[PDB]
Amino acid sequence: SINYILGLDIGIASVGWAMVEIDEEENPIRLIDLGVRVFERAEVPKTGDSLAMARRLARSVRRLTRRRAHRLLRTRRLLKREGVLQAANFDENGLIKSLPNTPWQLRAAALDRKLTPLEWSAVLLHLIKHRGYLLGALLKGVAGNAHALQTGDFRTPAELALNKFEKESGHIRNQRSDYSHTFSRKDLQAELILLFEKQKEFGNPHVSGGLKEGIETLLMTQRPALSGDAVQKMLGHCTFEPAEPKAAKNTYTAERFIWLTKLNNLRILEQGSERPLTDTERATLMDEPYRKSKLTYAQARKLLGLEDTAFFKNAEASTLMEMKAYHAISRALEKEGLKDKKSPLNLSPELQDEIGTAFSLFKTDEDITGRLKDRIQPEILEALLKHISFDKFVQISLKALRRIVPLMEQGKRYDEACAEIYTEEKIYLPPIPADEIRNPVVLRALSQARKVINGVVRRYGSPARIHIETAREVGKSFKDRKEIEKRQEENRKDREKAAAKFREYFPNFVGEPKSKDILKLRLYEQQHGKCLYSGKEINLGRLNEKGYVEIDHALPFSRTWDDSFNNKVLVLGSENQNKGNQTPYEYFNGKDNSREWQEFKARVETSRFPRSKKQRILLQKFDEDGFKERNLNDTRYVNRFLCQFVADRMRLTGKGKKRVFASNGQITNLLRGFWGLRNDRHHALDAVVVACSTVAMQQKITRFVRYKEMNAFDTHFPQPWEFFAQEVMIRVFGKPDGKPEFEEADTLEKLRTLLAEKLSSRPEAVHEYVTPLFVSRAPNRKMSGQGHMETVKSAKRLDEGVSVLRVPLTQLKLKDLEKMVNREREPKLYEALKARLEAHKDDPAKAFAEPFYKYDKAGNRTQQVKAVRVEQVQKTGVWVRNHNGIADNATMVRVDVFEKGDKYYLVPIYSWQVAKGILPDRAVVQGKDEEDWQLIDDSFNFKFSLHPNDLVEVITKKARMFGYFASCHRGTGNINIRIHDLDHKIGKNGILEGIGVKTALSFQKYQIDELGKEIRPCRLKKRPPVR
Amino acid sequence: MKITSSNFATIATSENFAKLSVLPKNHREPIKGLFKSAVEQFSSARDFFKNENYSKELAEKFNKEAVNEAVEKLQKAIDLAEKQGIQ
RNA sequence: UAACUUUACGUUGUAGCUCCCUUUCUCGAAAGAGAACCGUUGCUACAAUAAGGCCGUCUGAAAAGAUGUGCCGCAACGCUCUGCCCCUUAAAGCUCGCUUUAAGGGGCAUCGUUU
């Protein structure tokens, strides 16, 4: 119904959108709607870790501890059921009673004295529990321990631990995040076998074969590493032949398929172009993998023999394809000693295919000798059953392979090959595929952009064209972004230094030397006191003179659109009056190689111009078309993918065929500067600038610059419409241009009358779709998350507000020194700790770098004080470690709002309460602790529930607040609200702390759409359960 | 319906694993987990020969134990699925 | 990218040995010492190492509590299934504008997939 162009500005934390109505010639005539959507970037803002790292670490730790506990339990079961254990020694849900507390001394004394049955289970359990290692410090420690074992009398690792290991540093097991006291699992096998042999030598009715077998199984039990999905590891069927099972990713034909598929689309990149392998190149690279294993990026290059002019679609060194099955079979044959080191494998492809199928379908010796006995020689079966194991299944059957492989060898492409042998448009964009987008931030940004596009298409209709502009910070890693920020800061500092240098030459220049004269003077400095084109010299009178020097483009704008920083040069008063839209190749007689060209080349050859600008002195018949096309578009992965996806997967009611225009960055700044347009609302400004850069505006701009390039104006730059810089500013900020002290209009009536008053000459400034901009934020209504803080505290003194926590000395400060649990029971220790602390002015790292010693009464010393347990306040917490520890509460996940007597009460709900299913009943009361909180009963009406980032509104007796709820303080009962656009002039950094919810006249939570429209109140019906 | 270490892969198929999507979550999760664990264990029940530290009899001892564990796991999974009433 | 076998830590509780230690008991040479119920420095051992959910088996009637050579439990994406909210049209009636049921479109999840 409405013809319009939709402009998008996509960042890593926001997406601005605008719609510009166009005529039949793609010319802006109106500004219909605009808006901004804000979210949180899909990464940790503090460091840059992915959003799913803590979850992965916690899952790994959980699995590790579960496996260790299960292994110890199985060891106990084996020691009870398969030997002498006297199962009256095992009581309740408990363990071996009266277990000795010194396995380490026992394990080193089992070769000179019999061990009691009560002293055998201890050493066995200790060996199973700490079973050693199977990344530099750990390897160095185990290597040093191995070297130490084979030097002195250290027949057992336990003897090493007892003799030289503990008497030096006073400990046996490692402390802190260090790596010295680690052992290898092979050494533990050696010690275990020595223990069993030399202890059966002395006696003991134990040490049967079952004990040895069980302990050796438990000691060398490690789960095999998982890889890939689980559906891929199953025997399915064929997509083309529904009568034969799949094939393994080990057979000759399947790996031939993989190799041909990878080789066909190599796409050797010649200086940025598309240079595929021809028939003669693919006839040689085909057989290289099958002959050598590590075929890397450069390994093919030597066969290609190029001269750095052909890249690939050092650091670029990765195996493009590897022979897994072939070299695995070759090694299995070689290690038995029945094949030379380097020779072709004397086996038909059918034989390797059949052994691969058998090895991937059956995993027992009997079955593998049940299917390979009649096909391979007697030695081959045994040689294969010693170093060979295969897995995984491809989705292509064996029968179809015999047809697919020959065609791909003939050069036919995959798709046409399988077609000969054997993406429709929609209204809304489909979900962004995560296969190609291997980045979380980019995926989240594109998902939000797709949501905005779907919403606007739903509200208005199919857009004619989409103009995408992405900030330079998108599609980049965190380190590159930080480098960009530091480079920008350094550039700003250098600009300030250059400005300070400028303020010396001509103080009389007005009262504010700006950056334009700075650029003029800097470019003058580049010429090194010389002039260009004209050939005259420096010592001109006044640097500005209003006409003496004019910044001009060397290559004309009308043909290049290449402002950049290289093209612009500064000339003198003479010359340049009859240049025109001529490149220097057609103006200085360079085509005929005259003096007018060589002289100026010599003059500029001593300049300080950059390499790109220095080699842009001359352009030998450059492409006068693609160049202006290259500066008007974007050549990055994200922009190209967006263009392709929105071009194919949805409908755009345009006119041409390339109805997606990804614009550049410099062109946007040029347009915004030319047209007048100079908080978190400026995103829509670039959106409007971007959606008005149609090809018709480009045509008019080219005509204007070409006319003005000849000095033929014997008028300002063309604009989309008259009064452009005013209407856009009024629509965005609701205030007149450049007036941060003016009042803001946040209502339809106020904005409409402001538009009618300040733009009475434009009848199109008002329409039925004008609404003050409202920034929208991404909701977060997850009820999952952390259960409590990592640290846990003793809960013995929990009747009061007390909790004991052991802190190291190096971390303790003077603030917690006055809260030590034992403050009055040892006076001298506290005084010494204060004296050490009150020396370096609360510097614990530099004060406790020396050992601490509890000095005995009347002198002498005693044992170290490495850590001290201090006392902290604790009014509430979470019971963990099986009612043995108390932990701090987790992040707030829900608030329940109740109303009674024109008063509002907040009931906090945490994650652990959701997990246990115990919904709370106590509303927060300021001052009093939880035990004195107002209990909730049937007399309290329930209004709604608040999650983080939810639209709320309060009406207090002083003013009215409308914002996004962020956090609720349980100590006061006051909620915090962020202003919609996060204005720095309202509150502290856009937030309104300490809002008084209680005694408020009105309080209700609002609902907002994804485009910032449809702001309506919501009345929740009944309290939802936690689970 | 019996599961044996010889005819095992003919039953542990993608079709059999995907037939479980109809069951309610309280039943769907455990049998699917059992099937996945058994399939992975069978698929990785021979890397003990690829590692040179599991020398001599330990290698096929681990292989036999892993195969028995996998076949018992899928026997339990298929018994639970049979109780839930699928074919 | 996204994930995967482990290992060494940290914290809490109990037990053993060990240093300081504030009261209260036990005394003729004034000094101290000894035994205890508590605090607590260090070493070792053991248990727990998110809070917790599913499924199978045991004692059984109010319910457990254990048990398992099994998976999930701080994330991302999405709407086929389930829920909340908002918006249209319909059957209506309110009391003189809110609900009951709906069909459809969305947003978010306690829902689905990957882990």
Q: DSSP for A487-541, please give it.
A: HHHHHHHHHHHHHHHHHHH-TTSSS---HHHHHHHHHHHHTTSB-SSS--BS--S
Q: Which helix (H) or strand (E) holds A16?
A: strand A14-22
* DSSP reduced 3-state for A994: strand
Residue A197 and residue A108 in contact, taking contact as beta carbons nearer than 8 Å: no
Residue A739 and residue A753 in contact, taking contact as beta carbons nearer than 8 Å: no
Q: Which of residues 926-955 of A touch strand C (CB under 7 A)?
A: none
Q: Which residues contact A325 (CB under 8 A, 6 or more apart)?
A: A250, A251, A252, A255, A352, A356, A390
Which of A583, A599, A629 finishes a domain? A629
Antiparallel, parallel or unpaired: β A1002-1007 and A991-995: unpaired
CA distances to A96, A323, A326, A808, A819 from A376, in Å: 55, 22, 16, 67, 79
> Shortest Cα distance from B47 to chain A (angstroms)?
6
Tokens of A909: 């709900």
Confirm or deny that A187 is annotated as ligand binding. Answer: no
Asked if strand C contacts A859 at the CB level, meaning under 7 A, the answer is no
Indicate the angle between helix axes A349-361 and A252-264, nearest 10 degrees. Answer: 110
Query: CA A524, A529, A535, A537: dihedral to nearest 10 degrees?
Result: 120
Tokens of A262: 């990878």
**Cα first-last separation, chain A:** 46
Please pick, among A126, A206, A467, A553, the residue that the annotation labels catalytic: A553
* DSSP reduced 3-state for A163: helix
* DSSP reduced 3-state for A553: strand
3-state secondary structure A344-385: CCCCCHHHHHHHHHHHHHCCCHHHHHHHCCCCCCHHHHHHHC
Buried b (16+ CB within 10 A) or exposed e, A970-995: beebbbbbbbbbbbeebbeebbbeeb
Asked if strand C contacts A534 at the CB level, meaning under 7 A, the answer is no
CA distances to A203, A267, A268 from A311, in Å: 73, 9, 6
What total of structural domains would you count in chain A? 5
Count how many Cα atoms sit within 13 Å of the Cα of residue A862 in the half-sphere of its side chain.
Answer: 8
Q: Which residue is nearest to nucleotide C78 (CA to C1')?
A: A431
Q: What share of chain B is helix, strand, coil (3-state, %, to 5)?
A: 70, 0, 30
Whose C1' is closest to the CA of A141: which nucleotide? Answer: C8
Chain breaks in chain A (C to N over 2.5 A) after: 134, 313, 422, 678, 714
Which method was it determined by? cryo-EM
Antiparallel, parallel or unpaired: β A28-38 and A776-777: parallel
Count how many Cα atoms sit within 13 Å of the Cα of residue A153 in the half-sphere of its side chain.
Answer: 3
> How far is it, in rounded angstroms, from Cα A776 to Cα A38?
6
Residue A33 and residue A687 in contact, taking contact as beta carbons nearer than 8 Å: no
CA distances to A99, A299, A530, A614, A926 from A606, in Å: 88, 43, 10, 10, 76
Shared-domain flag, residues A876 and A931: no
Domain range for residue A113?
A: 84-93+100-207
With respect to residue A648, please indicate whether it lies within any of the assigned structural domains.
no
> How far is it, in rounded angstroms, from Cα A6 to Cα A455?
12
CA distances to A95, A723, A887 from A23, in Å: 85, 18, 65
Q: Which residue is nearest to nucleotide C79 (CA to C1')?
A: A431
Residue A642 and residue A468 in contact, taking contact as beta carbons nearer than 8 Å: yes
> How far is it, in rounded angstroms, from Cα B81 to Cα A354?
34
> How far is it, in rounded angstroms, from Cα A1003 to Cα A953?
6
> How far is it, in rounded angstroms, from Cα A768 to Cα A291?
73
> How far is it, in rounded angstroms, from Cα A455 to Cα A451?
6
CB neighbours (10 Å) of residue A585?
Answer: 17
Q: Which of residues 8-47 of B touch strand C (CB under 7 A)?
A: 21, 25-30, 32-34, 36-37
Domain ranges of chain B: 25-84
With respect to residue A426, please indicate whether it lies within any of the assigned structural domains.
no
Q: What's the Å distance between residue A56 CA and nucleotide C75 C1'?
A: 8
Could you say which DSSP state residue A807 is in? E
Tokens of A935: 């209990």
Q: What's the Å distance between residue A1018 CA and nucleotide C98 C1'?
A: 15
Buried b (16+ CB within 10 A) or exposed e, A258-273: ebbeebbebebeeeee
Q: Which residues contact A451 (CB under 8 A, 6 or more apart)?
A: A37, A1010
> How far is it, in rounded angstroms, from Cα A194 to Cα A186?
12
Which residues of B are less than 8 Å from A236 in CB distance? 13-15
Could you say which DSSP state residue A310 is in? -
Shared-domain flag, residues A391 and A273: yes
Report the amino acid identity of residue A887: A
Q: Which residue has the tokens 């009962």?
A: A973
CA distances to A901, A973, A976 from A999, in Å: 9, 12, 16
Among candidates A686, A760, A748, which has minimal Cα distance to A723?
A760
Which residues of A are less than 8 Å from B47 in CB distance? 224-225, 389
> How far is it, in rounded angstroms, from Cα A617 to Cα A282?
42
Residue A89 and residue A97 in contact, taking contact as beta carbons nearer than 8 Å: yes
Residue B38 and residue B77 in contact, taking contact as beta carbons nearer than 8 Å: yes
Q: What's the Å distance between residue A981 CA and nucleotide C112 C1'?
A: 34
Asked if strand C contacts A59 at the CB level, meaning under 7 A, the answer is yes
- Asked if A327 is an active-site residue, the reply is no
Among candidates A141, A158, A155, A53, which has minimal Cα distance to A103?
A158
| Main-chain dihedrals φ then ψ at residue A640, nearest 5 degrees | -65, -45
Report yes or no: A1027 at the B interface, CB cutoff 8 Å: no
With respect to residue A640, please indicate whether it lies within any of the assigned structural domains.
no
> How far is it, in rounded angstroms, from Cα A248 to Cα A255?
9
Among candidates A194, A206, A196, which has minimal Cα distance to A159?
A194
Which of A629, A651, A669 finishes a domain? A629
| Main-chain dihedrals φ then ψ at residue A995, nearest 5 degrees | -75, 130
Among candidates A1010, A1017, A1014, which has minimal Cα distance to A38?
A1010
Rg (CA), chain B: 15
Tokens of A499: 């400005």
Shared-domain flag, residues A872 and A915: no
> How far is it, in rounded angstroms, from Cα A562 to Cα A554?
10
With respect to residue A1027, please indicate whether it lies within any of the assigned structural domains.
no
Report yes or no: A388 at the B interface, CB cutoff 8 Å: yes
Whose C1' is closest to the CA of A127: which nucleotide? Answer: C45
> How far is it, in rounded angstroms, from Cα A746 to Cα A754?
11
Q: Which residue is nearest to nucleotide C70 (CA to C1')?
A: B34
> How far is it, in rounded angstroms, from Cα A43 to Cα A50?
5
Shared-domain flag, residues A285 and A404: yes
> Shortest Cα distance from B49 to chain A (angstroms)?
5
> How far is it, in rounded angstroms, from Cα A830 to Cα A384?
71
Asked if strand C contacts A318 at the CB level, meaning under 7 A, the answer is no
| Main-chain dihedrals φ then ψ at residue B17, nearest 5 degrees | -70, -35
Q: Which residue has the tokens 């598929």?
A: A261
Strands (E), A81-229: none
Whose C1' is closest to the CA of A180: which nucleotide? Answer: C8
> How far is it, in rounded angstroms, from Cα A660 to Cα A453?
14
> Shortest Cα distance from B84 to chain A (angstroms)?
22
Antiparallel, parallel or unpaired: β A867-872 and A941-946: unpaired
Count how many Cα atoms sit within 13 Å of the Cα of residue A522 in the half-sphere of its side chain.
Answer: 17
Q: What's the Å distance between residue A100 CA and nucleotide C16 C1'?
A: 9
Tokens of A690: 């971007």
> Shortest Cα distance from A822 to chain B (angstroms)?
51
With respect to residue A12, please indicate whether it lies within any of the assigned structural domains.
no
CA distances to A13, A901, A903, A907 from A925, in Å: 37, 15, 12, 10
Among candidates A629, A707, A641, A724, which has minimal Cα distance to A667?
A629
> How far is it, in rounded angstroms, from Cα A394 to Cα A413?
19
Interface test with A, best of B14, B21, B62 (most A CBs within 10 A): B14
Shared-domain flag, residues A538 and A609: yes
Tokens of A773: 């901009």
Among candidates A262, A254, A241, which has minimal Cα distance to A354?
A254
CA distances to A753, A848, A851, A984, B64 from A833, in Å: 71, 10, 12, 46, 62
The distance of Cα A795 from the centroid of its chain, to the nearest Å, equals 39
Confirm or deny that A178 is annotated as ligand binding. Answer: no
Q: Which helix (H) or strand (E) holds A448?
A: helix A440-459
Among candidates B73, B31, B7, B3, which has minimal Cα distance to A235?
B7
> How far is it, in rounded angstroms, from Cα A551 to Cα A808?
66
Residue A944 and residue A1018 in contact, taking contact as beta carbons nearer than 8 Å: yes
Q: Which helix (H) or strand (E) holds A119?
A: helix A117-129
Q: Which residue is nearest to nucleotide C83 (CA to C1')?
A: A1024
Contacts 24+ apart (CB under 8 A), A520-523: A520/A544, A520/A549, A520/A551, A520/A570, A522/A498, A523/A551, A523/A568, A523/A569, A523/A570
Report yes or no: A193 at the B interface, CB cutoff 8 Å: no
Asked if strand C contacts A177 at the CB level, meaning under 7 A, the answer is yes
With respect to residue A956, please indicate whether it lies within any of the assigned structural domains.
yes
With respect to residue A271, please indicate whether it lies within any of the assigned structural domains.
yes
Verify whether the Cβ–Cβ distance A391 to B14 is below 8 Å.
no
Q: What share of chain A is helix, strand, coil (3-state, %, to 5)?
A: 35, 15, 50
| Main-chain dihedrals φ then ψ at residue A292, nearest 5 degrees | -135, 150
> How far is it, in rounded angstroms, from Cα A981 to Cα A778?
13
Verify whether the Cβ–Cβ distance B43 to A388 is below 8 Å.
no
Shared-domain flag, residues A962 and A875: no
Which residues of B are less than 8 Å from A217 in CB distance? 58, 61-62, 65
Whose C1' is closest to the CA of A50: which nucleotide? Answer: C75
Query: By CA distance, what is A212's nearest residue in B?
Result: B58
Q: Which residues contact A923 (CB under 8 A, 6 or more apart)?
A: A898, A905, A906, A907, A933, A934, A935, A936, A940
Shared-domain flag, residues A195 and A109: yes
> How far is it, in rounded angstroms, from Cα A298 to Cα A288?
13
Residue A408 and residue A414 in contact, taking contact as beta carbons nearer than 8 Å: yes
Report the amino acid identity of residue A1000: A
* DSSP reduced 3-state for A105: helix
Which of A207, A237, A256 finishes a domain? A207
Report yes or no: B82 at the A interface, CB cutoff 8 Å: no
Report the amino acid identity of residue A252: Y
Asked if strand C contacts A439 at the CB level, meaning under 7 A, the answer is yes
Verify whether the Cβ–Cβ distance A234 to B14 is below 8 Å.
yes
> Shortest Cα distance from A342 to chain B (angstroms)?
21
Antiparallel, parallel or unpaired: β A28-38 and A14-22: antiparallel
CA distances to A402, A638, A886 from A132, in Å: 50, 47, 32
With respect to residue A147, please indicate whether it lies within any of the assigned structural domains.
yes
CB neighbours (10 Å) of residue A134?
Answer: 10
Shared-domain flag, residues A191 and A317: no
Report the amino acid identity of residue A134: L
Q: Which residues contact A419 (CB under 8 A, 6 or more apart)?
A: none
Residues 7-46 of B with CB under 8 A from A: 9-10, 12-15, 17-18, 36, 39-40, 42-46
Residues in a beta bridge with A740? none
Among candidates A554, A560, A702, which has minimal Cα distance to A630?
A560
Angle at B55 between CA B54 and CA B60, to 5 degrees: 75
Residue A29 and residue A23 in contact, taking contact as beta carbons nearer than 8 Å: yes
Residue A449 and residue A6 in contact, taking contact as beta carbons nearer than 8 Å: no
Among candidates B62, B16, B50, B54, which has minimal Cα distance to B36?
B16
Please pick, among A9, A353, A686, A950, the residue that the annotation labels catalytic: A9
Q: What's the Å distance between residue A871 CA and nucleotide C22 C1'?
A: 18
> How far is it, in rounded angstroms, from Cα A175 to Cα A617?
67
Shared-domain flag, residues A861 and A930: no
CB neighbours (10 Å) of residue A904?
Answer: 20
> How far is it, in rounded angstroms, from Cα A820 to Cα A835?
15
Verify whether the Cβ–Cβ distance A237 to B15 is below 8 Å.
yes
Antiparallel, parallel or unpaired: β A960-968 and A950-955: antiparallel
Length of chain A: 1027
Which residues of A are less than 8 Å from B9 in CB distance? 235, 361-362
Asked if strand C contacts A135 at the CB level, meaning under 7 A, the answer is no
Q: Which of residues 142-171 of A touch strand C (CB under 7 A)?
A: 166, 170-171
CA distances to A585, A590, A911 from A602, in Å: 15, 13, 75
Residue B76 and residue B34 in contact, taking contact as beta carbons nearer than 8 Å: yes
> How far is it, in rounded angstroms, from Cα A18 to Cα A189?
71
Q: Which of residues 221-250 of A touch strand C (CB under 7 A)?
A: 221-227, 229-230
> How far is it, in rounded angstroms, from Cα A322 to Cα A324?
6
Asked if strand C contacts A107 at the CB level, meaning under 7 A, the answer is no
Positions on chain C within 7 A of a protein C-beta: 1-13, 15-16, 18-22, 39-56, 66-79, 83-87, 99, 105-115
Which is it for the CA torsion A186, A187, A190, A191, positive or negative?
negative
CA distances to A347, A431, A529, B49 from A386, in Å: 18, 48, 81, 6
Q: Which helix (H) or strand (E) holds A751?
A: helix A748-758
- Asked if A9 is an active-site residue, the reply is yes
Could you say which DSSP state residue A277 is in? -
The distance of Cα A993 from the centroid of its chain, to the nearest Å, equals 31
Q: Which helix (H) or strand (E) holds A942?
A: strand A941-946
Confirm or deny that A469 is annotated as ligand binding. Answer: yes
Q: Which residue has the tokens 């987790």?
A: A890
Nearest CB neighbour to A386, from listed B6, B49, B61: B49
Residue A134 and residue A222 in contact, taking contact as beta carbons nearer than 8 Å: yes
